[PDB]
Amino acid sequence: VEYRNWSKPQCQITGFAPFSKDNSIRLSAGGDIWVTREPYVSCDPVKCYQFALGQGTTLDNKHSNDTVHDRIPHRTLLMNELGVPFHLGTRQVCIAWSSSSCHDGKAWLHVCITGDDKNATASFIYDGRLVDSIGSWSQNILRTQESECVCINGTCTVVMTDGSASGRADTRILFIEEGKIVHISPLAGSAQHVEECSCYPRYPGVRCICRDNWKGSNRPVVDINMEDYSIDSSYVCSGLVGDTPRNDDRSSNSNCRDPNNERGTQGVKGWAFDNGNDLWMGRTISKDLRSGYETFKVIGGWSTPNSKSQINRQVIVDSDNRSGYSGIFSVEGKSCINRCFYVELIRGRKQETRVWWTSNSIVVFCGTSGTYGTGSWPDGANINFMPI
Amino acid sequence: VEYRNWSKPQCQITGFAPFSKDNSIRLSAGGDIWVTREPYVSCDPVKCYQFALGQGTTLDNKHSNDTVHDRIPHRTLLMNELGVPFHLGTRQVCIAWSSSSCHDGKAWLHVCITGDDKNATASFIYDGRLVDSIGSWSQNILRTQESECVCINGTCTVVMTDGSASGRADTRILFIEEGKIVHISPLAGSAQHVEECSCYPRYPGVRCICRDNWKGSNRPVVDINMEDYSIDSSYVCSGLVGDTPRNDDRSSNSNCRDPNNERGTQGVKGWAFDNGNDLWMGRTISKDLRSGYETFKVIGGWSTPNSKSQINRQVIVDSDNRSGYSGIFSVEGKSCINRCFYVELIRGRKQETRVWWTSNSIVVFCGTSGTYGTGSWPDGANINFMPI
Amino acid sequence: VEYRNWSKPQCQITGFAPFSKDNSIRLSAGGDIWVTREPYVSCDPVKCYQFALGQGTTLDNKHSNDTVHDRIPHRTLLMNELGVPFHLGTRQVCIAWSSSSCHDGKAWLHVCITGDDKNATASFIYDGRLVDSIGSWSQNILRTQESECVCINGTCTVVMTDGSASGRADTRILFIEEGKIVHISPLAGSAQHVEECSCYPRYPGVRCICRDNWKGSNRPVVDINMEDYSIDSSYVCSGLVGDTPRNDDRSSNSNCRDPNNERGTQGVKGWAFDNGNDLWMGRTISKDLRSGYETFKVIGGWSTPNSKSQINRQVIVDSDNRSGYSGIFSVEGKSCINRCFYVELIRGRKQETRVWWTSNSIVVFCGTSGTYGTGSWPDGANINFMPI
Amino acid sequence: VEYRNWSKPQCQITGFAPFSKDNSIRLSAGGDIWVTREPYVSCDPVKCYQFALGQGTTLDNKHSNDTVHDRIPHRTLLMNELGVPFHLGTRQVCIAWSSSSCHDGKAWLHVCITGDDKNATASFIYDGRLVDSIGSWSQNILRTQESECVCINGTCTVVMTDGSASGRADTRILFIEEGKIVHISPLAGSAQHVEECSCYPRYPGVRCICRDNWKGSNRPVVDINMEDYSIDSSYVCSGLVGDTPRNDDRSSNSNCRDPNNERGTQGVKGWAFDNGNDLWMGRTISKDLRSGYETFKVIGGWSTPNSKSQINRQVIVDSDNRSGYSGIFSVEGKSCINRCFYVELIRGRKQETRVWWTSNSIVVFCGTSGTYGTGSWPDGANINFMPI
Ligand SMILES: *[C@@H]1O[C@H](CO[C@H]2O[C@@H](C)[C@@H](O)[C@@H](O)[C@@H]2O)[C@@H](O[C@@H]2O[C@H](CO)[C@@H](O[C@@H]3O[C@H](CO)[C@@H](O)[C@H](O)[C@@H]3O)[C@H](O)[C@H]2NC(C)=O)[C@H](O)[C@H]1NC(C)=O
Ligand SMILES: *[C@@H]1O[C@H](CO[C@H]2O[C@@H](C)[C@@H](O)[C@@H](O)[C@@H]2O)[C@@H](O[C@@H]2O[C@H](CO)[C@@H](O[C@@H]3O[C@H](CO)[C@@H](O)[C@H](O)[C@@H]3O)[C@H](O)[C@H]2NC(C)=O)[C@H](O)[C@H]1NC(C)=O
Ligand SMILES: *[C@@H]1O[C@H](CO[C@H]2O[C@@H](C)[C@@H](O)[C@@H](O)[C@@H]2O)[C@@H](O[C@@H]2O[C@H](CO)[C@@H](O[C@@H]3O[C@H](CO)[C@@H](O)[C@H](O)[C@@H]3O)[C@H](O)[C@H]2NC(C)=O)[C@H](O)[C@H]1NC(C)=O
Ligand SMILES: *[C@@H]1O[C@H](CO[C@H]2O[C@@H](C)[C@@H](O)[C@@H](O)[C@@H]2O)[C@@H](O[C@@H]2O[C@H](CO)[C@@H](O[C@@H]3O[C@H](CO)[C@@H](O)[C@H](O)[C@@H]3O)[C@H](O)[C@H]2NC(C)=O)[C@H](O)[C@H]1NC(C)=O
Ligand SMILES: *[C@@H]1O[C@H](CO)[C@@H](O[C@@H]2O[C@H](CO)[C@@H](O)[C@H](O)[C@H]2NC(C)=O)[C@H](O)[C@H]1NC(C)=O
Ligand SMILES: *[C@@H]1O[C@H](CO)[C@@H](O[C@@H]2O[C@H](CO)[C@@H](O)[C@H](O)[C@H]2NC(C)=O)[C@H](O)[C@H]1NC(C)=O
Ligand SMILES: *[C@@H]1O[C@H](CO)[C@@H](O[C@@H]2O[C@H](CO)[C@@H](O)[C@H](O)[C@H]2NC(C)=O)[C@H](O)[C@H]1NC(C)=O
Ligand SMILES: *[C@@H]1O[C@H](CO)[C@@H](O[C@@H]2O[C@H](CO)[C@@H](O)[C@H](O)[C@H]2NC(C)=O)[C@H](O)[C@H]1NC(C)=O
Ligand SMILES: *[C@@H]1O[C@H](CO)[C@@H](O[C@@H]2O[C@H](CO)[C@@H](O)[C@H](O)[C@H]2NC(C)=O)[C@H](O)[C@H]1NC(C)=O
Ligand SMILES: *[C@@H]1O[C@H](CO)[C@@H](O[C@@H]2O[C@H](CO)[C@@H](O)[C@H](O)[C@H]2NC(C)=O)[C@H](O)[C@H]1NC(C)=O
Ligand SMILES: *[C@@H]1O[C@H](CO)[C@@H](O[C@@H]2O[C@H](CO)[C@@H](O)[C@H](O)[C@H]2NC(C)=O)[C@H](O)[C@H]1NC(C)=O
Ligand SMILES: *[C@@H]1O[C@H](CO)[C@@H](O[C@@H]2O[C@H](CO)[C@@H](O)[C@H](O)[C@H]2NC(C)=O)[C@H](O)[C@H]1NC(C)=O
Ligand SMILES: [Ca+2]
Ligand SMILES: [Ca+2]
Ligand SMILES: [Ca+2]
Ligand SMILES: [Ca+2]
């Protein structure tokens, strides 16, 4: 095989279609299944694989107690064929409490981060081996995407952040070839605070719709020039707004340039993508907590500022159900590259107090140009049924 | 590899021989096994795989309660090598409460249907990716075969129905190439109500022996012309009759043209196939409920109307045991293409009331030209032993 | 690949060396493992696989009760890489209560037998498909080897028996090519009663050391001429004697020609092989029940009648432990074809009455030309620990 | 493929980076996982596999009681892809209570030892078959490395010992090609007692840093000349000292030539490797028991005697946690061959008395030339949570 170049236009879509569902939680009630969080998906040239950072235990395990915590030395990245649940035979590809993964065309690149919060180490494992590594630069939680990185012509991009979870941080874009760090670009542009990036190829460059955790409800954009390693950044134009927390659609706005300063602190891993002057996005239905999920196109949402005109809406998860993080993944077709997405459905502790654990399920949809319907596909577990 | 064309005569058979049995239920009593219904089998050029629509839980799981229901957002299609049981490592290839699957020669085509009964969406996933999709046309339960579709020269056929489960519906035949819908043919002919088709290659065309759920006990035939996408339909000639419910062999009949109007409402997924003027079929032994299974040739059962003369009978499942749906699958040999079949053995709720669940087992036989014997191969689980 | 021809001399051995052990039973006490009996092993050109006829349930399952019975419609053949235990992911390759399996060089040939004792059917599945089948000829338990068959130049041999378990039976040798029965040879020679054959290549022919269940304690030999399909038969010469039951070494004998008529009724699947005028064999240490296992060469045990002079003895299983059936399997090396063997270690019911089940473990040794030691490798399960 | 020759310089490192962690024990509390000890890792040209000698039972099994014992007839070697835990589907490649394994470039070589302590047999299984075997030479526990052997130009080295665990023994280096023993070299040099060797390629020869169990706290070196099969031996120069037990850094020393005679009896499988005049090693932090693990370079630790000057220290396992054996494994990169290591973390009996079993977990780090941080990665199981 040769290197992936993602040289084909984007497919023109009408909406999305059901792709996969793992049903992890319902299964946990009667089977040895892993405790997870922060899942995502990628596809090499032939098939897709689902990932997630495990918690070092099975759900029906006394060790699952107090799993709300994001960072312990036992979290490792697990990889399986999309659709087969995280059973004991699953593979732990590395030690990591934060990750990103991508296939350049020749093989897989895994970026796993771990260690002490003030002095973490991030490993780059290419083609099954450790090729390079980097240590924390701001000594305050070195972190990254929690979803696929992308490669073009054998160079894969990854954006990491170190520093304040609610103040000026130090965001950088890394270029690695064959597992080795070839260049490092420091963030530039108007974007005030970048987190958990949401990247997708847009030849000849890569685009990320990230999370602003300090002063923004609107989402930051980070354009990466694969050529001279240049970087531009801003906020989406769409007057709707896809972060949580946020103001209601009537009291919302963005100018494409600076944080809207409305319920800016906190956030959630989100996504969006361009379609000419238009924009396709997804957000939780509630503006306060992570509940429900719906998607829609916003006419003029990319080019015009404060665009609120929406259409082609579909609810993935209904108003009454819990969701979580979200990401996008691109797949190469016969004539165009297609855009897909997954939804992490979290259940348990800190929100549902019967149990003492925290884990999650996933659902993924892919874009289509045909016709479709309506429905709702949530986790589906009866919190009252077994396990803790 | 090149595309499958199924260009070889049909093998001349004497009866059938034991092929496989999964024993799912006996195993469920002491192991983490999935809850299933509507199973089937297909074989790519080298090996056969067994499928079924799961219920999103393990049998020994509190979530298995009230599994009688045919449609929830958690049913997904599972695929395994024929003979290995549905364990936790099994793969959920898509979200679906109704499906069909086939291999064109180059890869697999999965047609999975899901969502709200009045507004369902059916996905076409070819070579591991989502390529097209279609929405409901009559807003009343869009459905399909629940067994393999077939491809000739890289074009695969699938027949779907939307509408009344006991009245005029809207049946259509879809032609898809490489995952994309290339043409749609509306039903024609004398067949009054088509359901859960039973298709098999008969170069240069495809033939389906379906289920009539409204006015017929006799079974409808749907001939598909791979050339001009033409479609003819009728009812089998055989005076015996292979549906359930039905009249006893003495008070039965068909004229090859219209529903026999005898105990027509309701039915069960069934099968049959031509052998010159003769016919090979299988039906449950009881005329009222789904119990037992036997097979036989009916001399003149294809060409002559109301043919009751039978021979070469074998009981697969004895009078005293439960069965269920049934399908056929064709396999290419060195000189002729051979016809096989599976039997879904359902156990549990709505019929056996000790337990609160519903699941099933399978047994499959393949045609032979040699000699064989007699016996009975049912599920084999002691309803009194464990699980609920 | 081309067809296997087994054209290399036999390796000259000094004794045997430890190869594999599955530890099934110890594992059953804390894991979902199958209930088995009549195991064996074969190796395709690259690796060995272990087989056994399952009982349609897990050990820690209420369905394991009364597993002593040799024939129910739920026994199917299971295949795994030698050394990985029979877990739920294991593959049931066919329905069978008696079998034999072999690889011709191009693929696998599975001969599985099942159905009613008076009217059984045996299936021939080649390269994953059903190619032929045969029905019972004496209506009294059609049976076969319970270990590998062998192929030379693409023709595989298998010996079946039908009839009296303790009287004149009808033994036949089947020749099948690519799954199809090409010729059938009826037994000839002096051998009075042939059962559970023990075959191995000895180019240009095949040799089997079977079990005499009627009038013999000495073992019958069945020579098959791959050329004209000719068949000769006799009894081993060795004055020792390798069947159970039997007379003690002082009151034993054979003349190479007829049954020794000493404790002839009953028996156990056994083995032996030529080494010039010498013979290598293995037998249980006890002359009454199946306990212990030891192997040795008998100087002149092939050519001279009533040879009792033995040497190079090794105990595999000590006097105090249970064993069971036994078989041989040949493996191709760089310059000679090597002879190996497995021992089935049965535990449970009809002999150990704490539990209500019956299952088994295996141990396998391969010939060597180097040096070795001593020891004992039995099942190893504490009948007092868990399960029933 | 052709034979591995390991012809590339050693990579120049700065320290080590996190690679893998299996979390076996936490998982055992809620899942069927094997009981292990003496683990290690090797990598064929494309991927790494983790090994360990099982105990013939699952942890949550009554059979796990009294697992402290190093040698029973039920221990067999298990192999899995590095990172997937020892579940029931795991493969037992051979019967062994002591082993070593390596890939010559063409395939795997497994050396498994078993039987009676006074008369053991060691098997050589190449490319899936038994090719040779050897019997004990001193009749007092024949043993070997418990970690990978190495091959250069298709000849693999392995060092075995037989005799006194605390007195003069008989150590030998075996050369085997394609599974066959081609030459045997008896130990020579100043090294007083060699055990559990720690070998790594250093073209054109192989080097081992072993364990001295009789009179030394410093570690012996065994240089093997792949050419004339010559052998030299000594003790490391470093005044620090990497064995346990040992004297504290202030009262320690070595002269590179003879045992330092300080707390010499007993020991633990350890490691080290040259870097010009420098040395990279790892040892438990405590000088008395196997607790904690730290690594560092000792300036001049190879060439100069009694070198105590250290730098670049990292703690893998903190002072407060249990560790165990340790080994190294080399991996080929694009321009240099890289050095890695694993740590066996043992938990349970004879030290932690709540439970009646003994098993272990693993953590592995690989060298890097980039930057890294700090942290601690121990087993992580709550001895109070479940299992015994
Ligand atoms: C999951 O989490 C909390 C805390 O459990 C931890 O306990 C420590 C010691 C350690 O083992 C760690 O691995 C565990 O995760 C548990 O909540 C406890 O609930 C009981 C309710 O009665 C409280 O009772 C009190 O417990 C003390 C001893 O701690 C008794 O002596 C007192 O009399 C009193 O009853 C207990 O303190 C709770 N602690 C907190 C912080 O809420 C929870 O039970 C645990 N287990 C489960 C099944 O979820
Ligand atoms: C499987 O199905 C039925 C219904 O269970 C559902 O319960 C709801 C609340 C939800 O959790 C859902 O996931 C469950 O599937 C169960 O049948 C019940 O049997 C008991 C027998 O005593 C009935 O008793 C009554 O129950 C009420 C509370 O519902 C009590 O307060 C009353 O005093 C009275 O005892 C119960 O109502 C039944 N309901 C029906 C509709 O039959 C069944 O038990 C369940 N579980 C199992 C193991 O099969
Ligand atoms: C395994 O086998 C035997 C027989 O069990 C079978 O029972 C039938 C009904 C069916 O379910 C089948 O699947 C089972 O395999 C069991 O042995 C029995 O042991 C009890 C000891 O008390 C006997 O007691 C008597 O049982 C009758 C009802 O059968 C009572 O009403 C009487 O009062 C009396 O107590 C029982 O008859 C035994 N039968 C025989 C033939 O020995 C065995 O328990 C079973 N189970 C287990 C765990 O091994
Ligand atoms: C794990 O190990 C020890 C020994 O168990 C072995 O028992 C033998 C018979 C065999 O089954 C083997 O497989 C087992 O491994 C167990 O320790 C025992 O603890 C009890 C505590 O009360 C002791 O009590 C005494 O036991 C005798 C019978 O042995 C009674 O009749 C006396 O009245 C008295 O209570 C017992 O002797 C202990 N033995 C030793 C050597 O410590 C341990 O319980 C076992 N099981 C578990 C769960 O760890
Ligand atoms: C992206 O990769 C494709 C796929 O490899 C490139 O296509 C080749 O490039 C041109 C287009 O016809 C010709 O020189 C070759 O015949 C093509 N063949 C194949 C197999 O790809 C494509 O050009 C690449 N795009 C870019 C911008 O480099
Ligand atoms: C990705 O690689 C393609 C494939 O070579 C690049 O396109 C070529 O650009 C070079 C110089 O950069 C020219 O010499 C060729 O004429 C162009 N096309 C081909 C098919 O060779 C492309 O510039 C690279 N793009 C990115 C984003 O790195
Ligand atoms: C169905 O496919 C077969 C198998 O590919 C076709 O066979 C080829 O067609 C003719 C028959 O000899 C020759 O031109 C080729 O030499 C055949 N070779 C191979 C490998 O198939 C067969 O013709 C096809 N049938 C139809 C009706 O198209
Ligand atoms: C299936 O494909 C075969 C293979 O080409 C078709 O048979 C050929 O038909 C074409 C035009 O349709 C002729 O030009 C060839 O001479 C015929 N045979 C071959 C081997 O090329 C066949 O018509 C197709 N059948 C179906 C049902 O689609
Ligand atoms: C058994 O098979 C082998 C292996 O295929 C045959 O060897 C060939 O036969 C002769 C011996 O040199 C030559 O004509 C070929 O060069 C050999 N090559 C290969 C790859 O095998 C062997 O002859 C066969 N034995 C018999 C009796 O037919
Ligand atoms: C197995 O096949 C070999 C390979 O051909 C046979 O040996 C040849 O015999 C034929 C006629 O039978 C001769 O024409 C050749 O000269 C012989 N050798 C070779 C290498 O071709 C052998 O007879 C067959 N043996 C068996 C037992 O079937
Ligand atoms: C070790 O193996 C390598 C890899 O196979 C050898 O490299 C070959 O040897 C020389 C170096 O260029 C040339 O003759 C070949 O062109 C090389 N090609 C390949 C694919 O390896 C290397 O020489 C070996 N080292 C030693 C000391 O033998
Ligand atoms: C490993 O193999 C290489 C590859 O051949 C050996 O290097 C060659 O040595 C031979 C004679 O030993 C010379 O004829 C060649 O000129 C040398 N190089 C090559 C690339 O062929 C090397 O000696 C062997 N090393 C070891 C440790 O066994
Ligand atoms: Ca925010
Ligand atoms: Ca009907
Ligand atoms: Ca006998
Ligand atoms: Ca020591």
Q: Which string of DSSP letters, residue by residue, matches C237-258? A: --SS---SS---TTS----SSS
Q: Which two tokens stand for residue D218?
A: 């410093």
Q: What type of residue is C45? A: P
Mark whether D117 is an active-site residue. no
- A-B C-beta contacts closer than 8 Å: 145
Give me the CATH number covering residue B305.
2.120.10.10
Resolution in A: 1.9
**Inter-residue contact D132 to D122 (CB < 8 Å):** no
Kindly state the helix (H) or strand (E) to which residue A24 belongs, with its residue range: helix A24-28
Q: Which residues of B touch C59 (CB under 8 A)?
A: 30
Contact A375 B114 (CB under 8 A): yes
Query: Which residue in B49, B200, B293, B325 is the catalytic one?
Result: B325
Alpha-carbon distances, residue A308 vs A15, A239, A288, C210, D232 (angstroms)? 18, 5, 19, 85, 80
Q: Tokens 């304690």 identify what position?
A: C217
Calculate the CA D363 to chain-centre distance: 13
Q: What 3-state class would DSSP assign to C370?
A: coil
Chain B from 129 to 148: CB within 8 A of any A CB: 129-136
Q: How many angstroms separate the CA atoms of C346 and C340, rounded?
A: 20
Pocket of ligand 4 (CB under 6 A): C 382, 384; D 65-66, 356, 388
- Please tell me the distance in Å from A92's CA to the nearest CA on chain D: 5
Widest Cα–Cα separation across chain B: 56
Q: What 3-state class would DSSP assign to B24?
A: helix
Contacts of A188 (CB under 8 A, 6+ apart): A231, A232, A233
Q: Which two tokens stand for residue C207?
A: 């040799």
Q: How many angstroms separate the CA atoms of C219 and D186, rounded?
A: 48
Alpha-carbon distances, residue C258 vs B94, C193, C198, C248 (angstroms)? 65, 10, 19, 19
User: Judging by beta carbons within 10 Å of its beta carbon (0-12, 13-18, 19+), is residue A308 exposed, middle or buried?
Assistant: middle
Contact B116 A386 (CB under 8 A): no
The conformation of residue C28, written as its DSSP 8-state character, comes to H
Q: Tokens 């003492």 identify what position?
A: A356
Of the candidates D81, D88, D8, D7, the one whose C-alpha atom is nearest the C-alpha of residue D43 is D81
Q: Which two tokens stand for residue B299?
A: 């001399």
Q: How many angstroms separate the CA atoms of C67 and D28, rounded?
A: 30
Mutational test site, ligand 8, from B4, B5, B202, B224, max ligand atoms within 8 Å of CB: B5
Q: Which two tokens stand for residue B371?
A: 């000699």
Of the candidates D251, D244, D249, the one whose C-alpha atom is nearest the C-alpha of residue D216 is D244
Q: How many angstroms separate the CA atoms of C192 and B247, rounded?
A: 56
Q: How many angstroms separate the CA atoms of A32 and A28, rounded?
A: 6
Contact C93 B85 (CB under 8 A): no
Tell me how far apart the terminal alpha carbons of chain C are, to the nearest angstrom: 48
User: Judging by beta carbons within 10 Å of its beta carbon (0-12, 13-18, 19+), is residue B329 exposed, middle or buried?
Assistant: buried
Tell me how far apart the terminal alpha carbons of chain A are, to the nearest angstrom: 48
Q: Tokens 């949570």 identify what position?
A: D385
Which of C8, C22, C27 is the mutation pick for testing D, counting most D CBs within 10 A? C27
Atom of ligand 3 lying closest to residue C388 CA: 48
Q: What share of chain B is helix, strand, coil (3-state, %, to 5)?
A: 0, 45, 50
Pairing of strands B129-135, B121-126: antiparallel
**Inter-residue contact B308 to B300 (CB < 8 Å):** no
Q: How many angstroms separate the CA atoms of A349 and A357, rounded?
A: 5
Cross-strand partners of B17: B366
Range of the domain at B228: 1-388
**In chain D, how many H helices and how many E strands?**
1, 24
**Inter-residue contact B219 to B236 (CB < 8 Å):** yes
**Inter-residue contact D157 to D173 (CB < 8 Å):** yes
Widest Cα–Cα separation across chain D: 56
Which of D368, D369, D383, D384 is the mutation pick for testing A, counting most A CBs within 10 A? D368
Q: Is D267 annotated as a binding residue?
A: no
Contacts of B58 (CB under 8 A, 6+ apart): A27, A29, A30, A31, B32, B33, B34, B35, B64, B88
- Please tell me the distance in Å from B61's CA to the nearest CA on chain A: 5
Q: How many angstroms separate the CA atoms of D25 and D35, rounded?
A: 9
- Please tell me the distance in Å from A290's CA to the nearest CA on chain D: 30
Contact C17 D91 (CB under 8 A): no
Contact C18 D89 (CB under 8 A): no
Pairing of strands C129-135, D326-332: unpaired
Q: Which residues of B touch C32 (CB under 8 A)?
A: 30-32
Count other Cβ atoms within 10 Å, centred on residue D118.
13
Q: How many angstroms separate the CA atoms of D102 and D109, rounded?
A: 5
Q: Tokens 């080929």 identify what position?
A: D332
Q: How many angstroms separate the CA atoms of A81 and B232, rounded?
A: 42
Q: What does the radius of gyration of chain B's CA atoms come to, in whole angstroms?
A: 19
Q: Which two tokens stand for residue C141?
A: 């338990």
Q: How many angstroms separate the CA atoms of D222 and D148, rounded?
A: 15
Mutational test site, ligand 3, from C354, C356, C357, max ligand atoms within 8 Å of CB: C356
Q: How many angstroms separate the CA atoms of D323 and D344, rounded?
A: 6
| Total count of domains within chain C | 1
The CB of B356 under 6 Å from ligand 2? The reply is: yes
Q: What type of residue is A222? A: V
Q: Tokens 């549906």 identify what position?
A: B243
Q: How many angstroms separate the CA atoms of D256 and B283, rounded?
A: 86
Q: What 3-state class would DSSP assign to B133?
A: strand
Of the candidates D360, D352, D349, the one whose C-alpha atom is nearest the C-alpha of residue D66 is D349
Q: What 3-state class would DSSP assign to A27?
A: helix
Q: How many angstroms separate the CA atoms of A241 and A250, rounded?
A: 11
Cross-strand partners of B326: B343
The conformation of residue D25, written as its DSSP 8-state character, comes to H
Pairing of strands A310-322, A291-298: antiparallel
Nearest by CB to residue A130, choosing from D30, D334, D366, is D366
Of the candidates C298, C293, C311, the one whose C-alpha atom is nearest the C-alpha of residue C364 is C293
Q: How many angstroms separate the CA atoms of C284 and C266, rounded?
A: 14
Q: What type of residue is D91? A: R
Q: Which ligand is nearest to the CA of A210?
A: 13
Q: What 3-state class would DSSP assign to A28?
A: helix
Q: Which two tokens stand for residue D221?
A: 């070196």
Pairing of strands C48-58, C34-43: antiparallel
Q: How many angstroms separate the CA atoms of B371 and B368, rounded?
A: 8
* Strands of the sheet with C278-283, listed across from one edge: C271-275, C278-283, C291-298, C310-322
Contact B30 C58 (CB under 8 A): yes
